[PDB]
PDB file of C-alpha atoms in Angstrom:
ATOM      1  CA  UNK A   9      96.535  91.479  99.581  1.00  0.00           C
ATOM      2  CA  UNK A  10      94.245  94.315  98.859  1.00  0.00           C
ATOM      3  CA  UNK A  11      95.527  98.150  98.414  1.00  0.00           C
ATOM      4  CA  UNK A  12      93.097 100.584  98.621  1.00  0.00           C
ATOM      5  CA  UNK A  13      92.850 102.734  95.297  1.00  0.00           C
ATOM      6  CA  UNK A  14      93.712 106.203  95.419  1.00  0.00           C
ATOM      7  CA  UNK A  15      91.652 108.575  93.582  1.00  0.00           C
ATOM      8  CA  UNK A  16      92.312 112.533  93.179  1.00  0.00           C
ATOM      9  CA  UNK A  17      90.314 114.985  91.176  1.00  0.00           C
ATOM     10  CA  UNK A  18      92.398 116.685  88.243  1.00  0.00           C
ATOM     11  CA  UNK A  19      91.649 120.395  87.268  1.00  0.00           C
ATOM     12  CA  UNK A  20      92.446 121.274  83.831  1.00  0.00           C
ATOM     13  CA  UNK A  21      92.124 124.859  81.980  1.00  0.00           C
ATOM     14  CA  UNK A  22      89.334 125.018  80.489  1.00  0.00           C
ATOM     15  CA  UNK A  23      89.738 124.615  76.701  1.00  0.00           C
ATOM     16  CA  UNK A  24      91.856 121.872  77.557  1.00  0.00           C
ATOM     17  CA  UNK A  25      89.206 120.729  79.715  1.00  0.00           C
ATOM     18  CA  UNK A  26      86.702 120.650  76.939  1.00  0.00           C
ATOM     19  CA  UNK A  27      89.337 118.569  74.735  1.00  0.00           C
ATOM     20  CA  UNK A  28      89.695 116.321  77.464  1.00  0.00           C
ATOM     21  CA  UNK A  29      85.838 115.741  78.176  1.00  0.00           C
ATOM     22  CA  UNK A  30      85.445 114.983  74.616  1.00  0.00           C
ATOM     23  CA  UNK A  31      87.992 112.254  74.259  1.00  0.00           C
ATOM     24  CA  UNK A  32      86.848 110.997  77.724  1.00  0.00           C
ATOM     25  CA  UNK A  33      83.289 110.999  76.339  1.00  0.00           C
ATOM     26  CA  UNK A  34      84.593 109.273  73.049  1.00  0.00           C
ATOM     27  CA  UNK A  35      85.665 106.597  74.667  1.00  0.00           C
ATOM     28  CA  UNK A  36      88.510 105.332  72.363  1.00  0.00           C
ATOM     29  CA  UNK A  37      92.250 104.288  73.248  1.00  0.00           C
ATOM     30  CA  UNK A  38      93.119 107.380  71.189  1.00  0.00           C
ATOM     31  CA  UNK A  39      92.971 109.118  74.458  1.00  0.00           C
ATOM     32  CA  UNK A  40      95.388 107.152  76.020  1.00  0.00           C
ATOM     33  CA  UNK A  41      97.923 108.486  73.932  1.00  0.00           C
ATOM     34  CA  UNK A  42      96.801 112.169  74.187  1.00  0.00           C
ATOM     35  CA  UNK A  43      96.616 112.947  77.610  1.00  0.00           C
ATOM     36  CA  UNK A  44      99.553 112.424  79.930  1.00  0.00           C
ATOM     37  CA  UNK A  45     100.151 113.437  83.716  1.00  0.00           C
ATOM     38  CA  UNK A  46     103.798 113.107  84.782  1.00  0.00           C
ATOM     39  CA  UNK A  47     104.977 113.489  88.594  1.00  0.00           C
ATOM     40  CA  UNK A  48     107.594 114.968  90.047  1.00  0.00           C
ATOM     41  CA  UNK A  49     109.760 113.784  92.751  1.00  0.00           C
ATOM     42  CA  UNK A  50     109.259 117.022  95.004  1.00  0.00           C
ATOM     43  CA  UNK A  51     105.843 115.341  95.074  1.00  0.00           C
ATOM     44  CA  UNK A  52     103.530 118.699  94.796  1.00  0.00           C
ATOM     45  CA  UNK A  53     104.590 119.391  91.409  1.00  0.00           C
ATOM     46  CA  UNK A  54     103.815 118.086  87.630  1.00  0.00           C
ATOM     47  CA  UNK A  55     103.004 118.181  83.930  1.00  0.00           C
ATOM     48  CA  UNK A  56      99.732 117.129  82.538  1.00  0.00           C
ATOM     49  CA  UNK A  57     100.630 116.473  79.079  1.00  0.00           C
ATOM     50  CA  UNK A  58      97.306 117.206  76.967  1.00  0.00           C
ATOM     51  CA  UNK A  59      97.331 116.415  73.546  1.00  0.00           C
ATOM     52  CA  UNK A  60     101.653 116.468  73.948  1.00  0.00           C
ATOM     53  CA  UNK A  61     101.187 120.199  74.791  1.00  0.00           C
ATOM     54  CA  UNK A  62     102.677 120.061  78.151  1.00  0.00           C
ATOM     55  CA  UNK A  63     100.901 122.200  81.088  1.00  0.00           C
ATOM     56  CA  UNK A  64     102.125 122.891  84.444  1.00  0.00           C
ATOM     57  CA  UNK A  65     100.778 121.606  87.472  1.00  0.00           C
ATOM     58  CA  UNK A  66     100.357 121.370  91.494  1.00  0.00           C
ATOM     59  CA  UNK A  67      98.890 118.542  93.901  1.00  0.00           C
ATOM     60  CA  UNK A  68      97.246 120.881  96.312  1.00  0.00           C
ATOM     61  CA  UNK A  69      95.183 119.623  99.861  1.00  0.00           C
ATOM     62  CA  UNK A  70      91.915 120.311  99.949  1.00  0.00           C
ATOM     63  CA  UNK A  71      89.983 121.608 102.781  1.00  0.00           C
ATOM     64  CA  UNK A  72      87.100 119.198 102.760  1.00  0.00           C
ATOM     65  CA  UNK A  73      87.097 115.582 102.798  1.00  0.00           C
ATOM     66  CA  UNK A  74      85.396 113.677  99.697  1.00  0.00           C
ATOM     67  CA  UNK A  75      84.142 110.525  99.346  1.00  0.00           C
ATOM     68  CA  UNK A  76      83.257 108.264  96.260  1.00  0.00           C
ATOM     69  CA  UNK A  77      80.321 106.582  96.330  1.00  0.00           C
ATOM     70  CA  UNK A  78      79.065 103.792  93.656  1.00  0.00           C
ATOM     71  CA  UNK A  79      75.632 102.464  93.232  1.00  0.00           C
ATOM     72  CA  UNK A  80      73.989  99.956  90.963  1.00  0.00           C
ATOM     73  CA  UNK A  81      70.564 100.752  91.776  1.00  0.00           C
ATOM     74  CA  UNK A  82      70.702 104.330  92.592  1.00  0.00           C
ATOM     75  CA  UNK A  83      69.493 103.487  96.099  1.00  0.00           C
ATOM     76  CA  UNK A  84      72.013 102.360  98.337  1.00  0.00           C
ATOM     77  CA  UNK A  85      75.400 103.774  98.079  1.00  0.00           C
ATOM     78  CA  UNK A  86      78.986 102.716  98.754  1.00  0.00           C
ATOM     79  CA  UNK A  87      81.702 104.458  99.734  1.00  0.00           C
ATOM     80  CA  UNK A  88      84.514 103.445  97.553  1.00  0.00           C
ATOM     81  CA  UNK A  89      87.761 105.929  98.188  1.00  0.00           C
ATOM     82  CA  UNK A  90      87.980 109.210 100.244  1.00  0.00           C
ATOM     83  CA  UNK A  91      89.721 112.078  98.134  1.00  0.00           C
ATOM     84  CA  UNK A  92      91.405 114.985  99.720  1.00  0.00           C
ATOM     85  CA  UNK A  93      93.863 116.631  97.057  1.00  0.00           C
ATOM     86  CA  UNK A  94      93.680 117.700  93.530  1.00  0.00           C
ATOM     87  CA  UNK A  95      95.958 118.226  91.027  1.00  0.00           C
ATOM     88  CA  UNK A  96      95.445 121.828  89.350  1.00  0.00           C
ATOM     89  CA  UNK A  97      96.733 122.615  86.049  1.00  0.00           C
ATOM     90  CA  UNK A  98      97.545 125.825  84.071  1.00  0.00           C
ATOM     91  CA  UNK A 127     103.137 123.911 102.249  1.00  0.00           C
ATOM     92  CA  UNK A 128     100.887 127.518 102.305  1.00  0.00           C
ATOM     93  CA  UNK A 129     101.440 127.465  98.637  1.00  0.00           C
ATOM     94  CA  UNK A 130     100.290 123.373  98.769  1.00  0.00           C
ATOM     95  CA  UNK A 131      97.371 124.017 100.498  1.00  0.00           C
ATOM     96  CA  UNK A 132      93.700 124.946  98.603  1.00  0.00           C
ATOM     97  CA  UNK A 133      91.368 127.792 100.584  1.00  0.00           C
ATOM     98  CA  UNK A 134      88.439 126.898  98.836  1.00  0.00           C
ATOM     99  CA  UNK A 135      86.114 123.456  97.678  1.00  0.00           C
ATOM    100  CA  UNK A 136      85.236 122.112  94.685  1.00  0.00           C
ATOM    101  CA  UNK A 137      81.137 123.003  94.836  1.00  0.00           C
ATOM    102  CA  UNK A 138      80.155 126.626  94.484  1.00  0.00           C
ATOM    103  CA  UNK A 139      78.495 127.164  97.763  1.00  0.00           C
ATOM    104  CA  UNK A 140      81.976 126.331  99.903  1.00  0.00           C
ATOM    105  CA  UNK A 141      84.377 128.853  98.292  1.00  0.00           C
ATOM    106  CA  UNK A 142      86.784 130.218 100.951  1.00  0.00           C
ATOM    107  CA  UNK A 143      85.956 127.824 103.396  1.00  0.00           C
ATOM    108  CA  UNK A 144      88.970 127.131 105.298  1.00  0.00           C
ATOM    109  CA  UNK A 145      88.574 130.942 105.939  1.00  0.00           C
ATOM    110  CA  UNK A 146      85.011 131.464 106.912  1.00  0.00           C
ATOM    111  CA  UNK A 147      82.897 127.776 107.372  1.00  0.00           C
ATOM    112  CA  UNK A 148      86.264 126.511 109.560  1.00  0.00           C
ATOM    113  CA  UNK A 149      86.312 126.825 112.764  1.00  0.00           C
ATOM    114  CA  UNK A 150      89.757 127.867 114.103  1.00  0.00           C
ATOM    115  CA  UNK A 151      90.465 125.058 115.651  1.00  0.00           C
ATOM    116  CA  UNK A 152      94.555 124.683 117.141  1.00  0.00           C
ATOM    117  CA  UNK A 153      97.080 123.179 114.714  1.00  0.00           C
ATOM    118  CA  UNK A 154     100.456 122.315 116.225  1.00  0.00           C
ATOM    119  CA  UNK A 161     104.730 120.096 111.688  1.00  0.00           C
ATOM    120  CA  UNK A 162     105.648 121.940 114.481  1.00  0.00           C
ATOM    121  CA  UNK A 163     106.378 119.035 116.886  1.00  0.00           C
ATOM    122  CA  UNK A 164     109.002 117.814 114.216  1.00  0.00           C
ATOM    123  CA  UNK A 165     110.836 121.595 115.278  1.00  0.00           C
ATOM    124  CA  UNK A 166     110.248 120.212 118.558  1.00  0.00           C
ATOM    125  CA  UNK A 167     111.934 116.789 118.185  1.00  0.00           C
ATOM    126  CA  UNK A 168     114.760 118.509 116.205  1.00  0.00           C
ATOM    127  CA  UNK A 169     115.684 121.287 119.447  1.00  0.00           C
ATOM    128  CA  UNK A 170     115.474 117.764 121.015  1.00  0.00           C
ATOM    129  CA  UNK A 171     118.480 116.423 118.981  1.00  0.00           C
ATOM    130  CA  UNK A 172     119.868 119.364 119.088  1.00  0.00           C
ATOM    131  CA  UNK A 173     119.804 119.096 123.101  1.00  0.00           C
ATOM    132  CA  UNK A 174     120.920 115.458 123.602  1.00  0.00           C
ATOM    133  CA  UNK A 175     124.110 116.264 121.365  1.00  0.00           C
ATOM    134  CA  UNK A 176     124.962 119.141 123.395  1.00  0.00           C
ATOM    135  CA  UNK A 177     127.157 119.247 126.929  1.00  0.00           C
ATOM    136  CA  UNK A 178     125.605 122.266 128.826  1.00  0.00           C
ATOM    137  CA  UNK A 179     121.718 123.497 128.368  1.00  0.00           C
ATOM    138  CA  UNK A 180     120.764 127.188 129.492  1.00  0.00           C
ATOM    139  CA  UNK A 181     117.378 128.324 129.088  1.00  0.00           C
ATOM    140  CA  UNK A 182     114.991 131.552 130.638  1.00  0.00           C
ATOM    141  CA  UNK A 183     111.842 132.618 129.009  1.00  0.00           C
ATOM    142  CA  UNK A 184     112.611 136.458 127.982  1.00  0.00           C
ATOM    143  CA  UNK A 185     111.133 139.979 127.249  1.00  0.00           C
ATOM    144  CA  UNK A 186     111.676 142.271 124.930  1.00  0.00           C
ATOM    145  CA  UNK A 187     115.279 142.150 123.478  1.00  0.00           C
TER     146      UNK A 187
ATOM    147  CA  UNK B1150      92.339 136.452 105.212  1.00  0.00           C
ATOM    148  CA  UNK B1151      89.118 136.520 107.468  1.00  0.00           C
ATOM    149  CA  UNK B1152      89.394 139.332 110.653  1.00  0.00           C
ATOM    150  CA  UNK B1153      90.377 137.431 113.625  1.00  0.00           C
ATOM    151  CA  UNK B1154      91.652 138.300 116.914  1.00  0.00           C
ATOM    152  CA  UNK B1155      95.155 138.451 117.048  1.00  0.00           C
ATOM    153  CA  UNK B1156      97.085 136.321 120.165  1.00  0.00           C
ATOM    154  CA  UNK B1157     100.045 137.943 121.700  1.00  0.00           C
ATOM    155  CA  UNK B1158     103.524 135.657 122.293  1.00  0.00           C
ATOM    156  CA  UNK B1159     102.023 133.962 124.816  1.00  0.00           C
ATOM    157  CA  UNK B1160      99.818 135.131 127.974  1.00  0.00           C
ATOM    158  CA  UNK B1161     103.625 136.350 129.219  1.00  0.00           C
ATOM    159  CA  UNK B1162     104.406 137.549 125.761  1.00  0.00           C
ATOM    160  CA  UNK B1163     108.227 136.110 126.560  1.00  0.00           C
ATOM    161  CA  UNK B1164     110.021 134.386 124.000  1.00  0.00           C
ATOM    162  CA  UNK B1165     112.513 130.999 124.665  1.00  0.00           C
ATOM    163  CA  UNK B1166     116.258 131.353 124.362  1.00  0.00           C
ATOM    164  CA  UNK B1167     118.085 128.224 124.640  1.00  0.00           C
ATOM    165  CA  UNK B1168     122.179 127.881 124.947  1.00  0.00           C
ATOM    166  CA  UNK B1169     123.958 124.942 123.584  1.00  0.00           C
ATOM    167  CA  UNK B1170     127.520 123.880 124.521  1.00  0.00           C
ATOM    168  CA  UNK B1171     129.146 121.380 122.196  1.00  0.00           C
ATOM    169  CA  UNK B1172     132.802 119.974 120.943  1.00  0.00           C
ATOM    170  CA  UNK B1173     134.206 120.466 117.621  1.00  0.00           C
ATOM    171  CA  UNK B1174     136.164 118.029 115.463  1.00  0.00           C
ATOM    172  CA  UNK B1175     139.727 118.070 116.593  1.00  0.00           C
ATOM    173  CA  UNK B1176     139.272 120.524 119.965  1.00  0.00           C
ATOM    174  CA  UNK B1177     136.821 123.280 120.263  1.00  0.00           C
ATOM    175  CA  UNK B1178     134.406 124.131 122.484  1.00  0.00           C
ATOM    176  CA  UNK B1179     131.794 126.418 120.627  1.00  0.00           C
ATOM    177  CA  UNK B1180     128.626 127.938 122.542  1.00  0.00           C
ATOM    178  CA  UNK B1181     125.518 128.403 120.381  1.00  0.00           C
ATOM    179  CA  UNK B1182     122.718 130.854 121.783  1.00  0.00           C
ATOM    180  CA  UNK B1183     118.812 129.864 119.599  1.00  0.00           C
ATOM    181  CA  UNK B1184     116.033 132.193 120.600  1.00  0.00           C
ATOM    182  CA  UNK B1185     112.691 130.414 119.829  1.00  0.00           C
ATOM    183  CA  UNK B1186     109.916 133.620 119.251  1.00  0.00           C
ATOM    184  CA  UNK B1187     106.928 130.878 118.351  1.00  0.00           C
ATOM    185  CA  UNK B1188     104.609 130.096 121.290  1.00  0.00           C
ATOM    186  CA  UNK B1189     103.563 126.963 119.172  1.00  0.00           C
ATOM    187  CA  UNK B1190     107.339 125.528 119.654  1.00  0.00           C
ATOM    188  CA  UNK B1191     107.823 127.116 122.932  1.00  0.00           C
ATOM    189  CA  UNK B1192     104.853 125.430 124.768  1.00  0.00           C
ATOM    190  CA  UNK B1193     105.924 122.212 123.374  1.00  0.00           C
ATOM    191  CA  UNK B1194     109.398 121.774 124.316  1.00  0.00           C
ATOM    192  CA  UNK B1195     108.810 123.577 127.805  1.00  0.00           C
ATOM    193  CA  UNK B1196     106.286 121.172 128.385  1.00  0.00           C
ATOM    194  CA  UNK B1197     108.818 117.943 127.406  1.00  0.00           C
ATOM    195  CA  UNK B1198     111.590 119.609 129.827  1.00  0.00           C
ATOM    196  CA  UNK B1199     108.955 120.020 132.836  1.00  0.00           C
ATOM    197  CA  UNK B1200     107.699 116.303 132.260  1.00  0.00           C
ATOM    198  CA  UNK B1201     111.489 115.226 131.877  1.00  0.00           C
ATOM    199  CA  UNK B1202     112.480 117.236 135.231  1.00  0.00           C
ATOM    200  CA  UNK B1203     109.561 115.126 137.237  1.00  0.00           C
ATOM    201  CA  UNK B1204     110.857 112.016 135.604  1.00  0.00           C
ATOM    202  CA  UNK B1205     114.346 113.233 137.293  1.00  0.00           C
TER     203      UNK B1205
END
């Protein structure tokens, strides 16, 4: 079968960045060796080892959607993955405010609109549980207490 | 964060309290009283328990 590839964007400091770019530019193997990214198993945490010096780092959500796109002729265009999170180097804390191009910078704040985000029905399913286990349910919406 | 209008709890502003009545190992019986103050989780369960009392 087929798996679809899944591409994120790494964000590195930017010295390290620079170091990076230049051994990606190279081109050699050598590179191989120096840069590292481990992952954690809380999944939104990791190390990006560059050059063995070890650099701490997040896999955040980010509030756009974007999409690869490859070309041969520089005329027709195909999408190739969809990328939506980012691992930055140096939940609320999980989620990024702002995109990666300078004119959307606190997007999710201003350019969203507010639309209704209910997660929360996993609360729901667990009062559920919580219910069906149970003998005797009593329930009245209240005021101030 | 970006001025917005801020919603009260609910057109009603009233909170959910729910009572639970359950058994304990051996023999107990142990009454636990869970007050709900999010309008997010109160419209959703409220909404399951009137669907479930028309299925009754």
């Amino acid at each position: 079968p087929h798996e679809l590839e899944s591409q994120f964007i790494l964000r590195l400091p930017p010295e390290y960045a620079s170091t990076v770019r230049r051994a990606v530019q190279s081109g050699h193997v050598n590179l191989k060796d120096r840069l590292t990214i481990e992952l954690h198993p809380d999944g939104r945490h990791g190390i990006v080892r560059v050059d063995r010096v070890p650099l701490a780092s997040k896999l955040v959500d980010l509030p756009c959607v974007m999409e690869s796109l490859k070309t041969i002729d520089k005329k027709t265009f195909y999408k190739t993955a969809d990328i939506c999170q980012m691992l930055v180097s140096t939940e609320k804390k999980f989620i990024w405010n702002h995109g990666i191009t300078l004119p959307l910078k606190n997007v999710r704040k201003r350019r969203f609109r507010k639309t209704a985000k209910k997660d929360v029905e996993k609360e729901v399913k667990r009062l559920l549980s919580t219910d069906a286990e149970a003998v005797s349910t009593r329930w009245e919406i209240i005021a101030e207490d | 964060t970006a001025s917005v209008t801020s919603l009260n709890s609910s057109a009603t502003g009233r909170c959910l309290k729910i009572y639970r009545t359950f058994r304990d190992e051996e023999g107990k019986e142990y009454v636990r009283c869970e007050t709900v103050r999010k309008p997010a989780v109160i419209d959703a369960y409220v909404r399951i328990r009137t669907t479930k009392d028309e299925e009754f």
